[PDB]
Amino acid sequence: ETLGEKWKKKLNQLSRKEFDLYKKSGITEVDRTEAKEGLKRGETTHHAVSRGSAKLQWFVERNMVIPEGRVIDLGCGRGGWSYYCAGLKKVTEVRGYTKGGPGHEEPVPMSTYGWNIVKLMSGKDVFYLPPEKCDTLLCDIGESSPSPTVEESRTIRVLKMVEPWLKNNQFCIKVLNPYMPTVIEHLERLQRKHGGMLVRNPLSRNSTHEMYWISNGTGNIVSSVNMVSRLLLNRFTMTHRRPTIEKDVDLGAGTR
């Protein structure tokens, strides 16, 4: 039994009250007040449609992924990763696909900087999409479940699905459950072939062990996974630490 599995078991024991306090304890979060108010008013400029724009920006501004040319955004949701990439100098085209429909977010149309180079498509299950040529491959798919074996199956499926899209390009792929031994085996094989490294984003909630496989980096996958498991385990030991608050991103306005 891995450290991650011990973390999961403890998470599933928490009451809703304990869970809600644990999930943001000591994390970093952007202040969404202004964006939520603007989006409720139907404002289409400046606001990021979700917390996702700030989350991908954290990797981008650390050069862990450097979006360029044709960007494919798998599981785009409302479009936060897509609208963020739309304003980056090196990006020329953004194609987002998302499931939508009941239980899934629909793309939100925006007029933030570079909106005219974005195409978001709903009603698209990426597990049936044939791969397309692209310069940047992003994937943020991985639905949490109280069952780690269900999460293991979901994580492996994402990893098998993204590989044919990987052709010496920039990438940032969510790994929902990176601690299960079978997932580790796939991550190690994929890293030997495609390089990159698994990174924990400080904007992720403690209620998920998610890590991101990013193209520009090296390191030991097992060590990075066990470091996260120990961090999350130590976060149950103390009383709620209020999250570190940062400014949300301003995605501006205008065509390009």
Ligand SMILES: Nc1ncnc2c1ncn2[C@@H]1O[C@H](C[C@@H](N)CC[C@H](N)C(=O)O)[C@@H](O)[C@H]1O
């Ligand atoms: N099989 C699937 N094919 C397509 N989209 C999917 C599938 N499974 C889940 N999704 C979507 O993937 C999205 C994942 C989100 N974490 C994306 C948030 C996005 N990165 C943002 O910044 O707004 C959700 O909107 C799901 O509805």
